[model samples]
Target: MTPWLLFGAGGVGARTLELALAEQRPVVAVIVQVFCDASVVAAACRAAGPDALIISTMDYLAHRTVIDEAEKAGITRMILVTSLGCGDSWPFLSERAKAAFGQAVREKTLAESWLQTSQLDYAILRPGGLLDGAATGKAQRIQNQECHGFINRADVAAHIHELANAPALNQQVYSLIEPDLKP
Candidate 1:
């Protein structure tokens, strides 16, 4: 799907929108966190069409509703952002690292699992600690569950922008980071 639907346009979310516009991808909708009212996602998904790519950064709590709405609209693809400790990688994380927020991790974990079981094709991108450097365009999707460490937000956006052009779904979970920024 060349068209895109953006949820929670802040941080990587909004930057992804800019890349789409800069590259001339059709934008179906842009809904921020506060806008998740009764019909916000539904209406947005309708406009997005069946093949639109969803790039979302809303809270994990928001994903359930968003995914349900997207599936209801028959939207087929979505890429969601989470963090390193998510996707059940907690055991491999350091004890110090594990202390950050297990609760929040569980929240996104639930949402990630929710989307995984859903009808829509999905990719859950669990990036490492976020950095705000300029776009290096060097983000890599690591095969191992172990994180690649700190990453540039611009690079994340660029990666998502690239994924917006995929013809079909991989239906996989991914960890993204800049290889040079290992902690």
Candidate 2:
């Protein structure tokens, strides 16, 4: 498979995402935002392999352009990790958080919408608040689109990596969270 593509690179989750991709060694390519932590992303890509390409761009527009190019390159599989409360939930968030998180969701949601209408098989992971500590390895997969709450970033990355190879979830949107189950 050609390298998988990542759109963001600054947040705590993006770092975790980079680490997971490195550990998994899946063919991976990333597009970092202009002001994001490019150094960390580059280092992770370098460690991953020569095939792990990293680029700094403006966001969804750049991501879209790259996806178009990737499609031309015969790369079809896609995994998109976007934050929770992006699209229709913008009004539900505080103005401060919405300024950043809301914008991410908007762009990501639009990108997802584009992908959904396209011919490519894609998976979208919408995660809740991301804790940077160790993964709990216990997360809820929202099959019915009603999931919510916080989740460790590491676990989120784990799920993203797992879904990459699981063709069963193609063209699906999931909310990942750490469940409060008594088990």
Candidate 3:
């Protein structure tokens, strides 16, 4: 099997890395901030020659360059870790948070939109407030509705693993949170 490429080194990224490594999958983990040159990401993609790419960055446009590179490399699948209020959920965010993260929300929403229309098979995972804690192992409530809640980053990572392994979920977008926190 071809290696998987993972971007970001933050909470969700790190946990995804752990899960990927534990599964003994070939992975190329990139620890970098967004808005970096796409050339750099392209170079990494060329080197890793991944079958799929996972992005966990904050900036919405951060994956543009990499997506192009992936296309060139024949990478047809991607998993994007975006925030809860990224698309229709934007209106659910508090006004204060919206004011502060308005630009970010717009960018994230654009990124999600981009993946939806792209040629690549994509799964957009939008999670609510990301808390650092042990994996819940409890069933996660996955939906397409715009809702708000909190979830453990570890649990999200576990779900990413499951989703990545399932090829039939192409072009799907999921809003994920712990079952108890479903809104």
Candidate 4:
């Protein structure tokens, strides 16, 4: 079994992915900013038949460490669910937000780029704004840098679970969101 590490597992988008992973597959571990009790997620891991390791750390810094640990633990694959506009080539946010986000984007982009070039197999999921509503089961795949939109948290999770076993998507960054139809 491939042990999967999920970065930023505390958010709604990541939690939804947790639920989906619990239902049909195993999530070996989850790395988050904070863990209230840790047991809650531990229990979830237990139910999934594998202990879900929760590590408290920064996203970019932890990316490399996690990859090293994954390799040691025999985890050959990883799925990174990152925010939209994180690794952008343009400034699409307010100056202040852009400044802050710009730094993060650089880190995220570098971290992801490292993983892509690393020996481990990985998939990057960059979803748009995550809504709390139930999934609509609809989204778009973006390969270019200009497109952006919103997506339900549930829908994002659904797609992550499906992409887990898809060999065709290796080392690819997928942008997910509701398609725009208005002209």
Candidate No. with top lDDT: 1
TM-score of each: 0.88, 0.67, 0.87, 0.69
Weakest 10 consecutive residues of candidate 3 by summed lDDT: 28-37
lDDT of 4 by residue, 43-146 (tens): 33333333232221134656666655555544455666666666653355457656767777667776777777876666777777667767677777677666
Residue 171 shift from truth in candidate 1, angstroms: 0.9
lDDT of 1 by residue, 1-183 (tens): 266888877588777777777877777655422235537778788777777788887656578888888888888889988877887676666777667677787788888888889987777888888887778877887766576488888888987866665666588777888877844
lDDT of each: 0.76, 0.57, 0.73, 0.57
Our tally of clashes for model 1 stands at 0
Q: Write the per-residue lDDT of candidate 2 for residues 33-136, one digit (tens) a residue.
A: 22124454444444434433222112566556644554544455556666677555445556777776766667877766766776556666777777666767
Q: Predictions ranked by TM-score, top down? A: 1, 3, 4, 2
* Cα lDDT, model 3, residue 33: 26
Candidate 1's displacement at residue 61, Å, is 3.4
lDDT of 4 at 137: 70
Instruction: Give the poorly placed runs of model 3, Cα more than 4 Å off.
Output: 32-35, 139-141, 181-183
Per-residue accuracy of model 3 over 38-108 as CA lDDT, tens digit each: 77777777666656565554465566766667778777778887877788878778998798878877788
Question: Which model is ahead, 2 or 3, in terms of lDDT?
Answer: 3
Candidate 1 residue-wise lDDT at 85? 81
The best candidate in terms of TM-score: 1
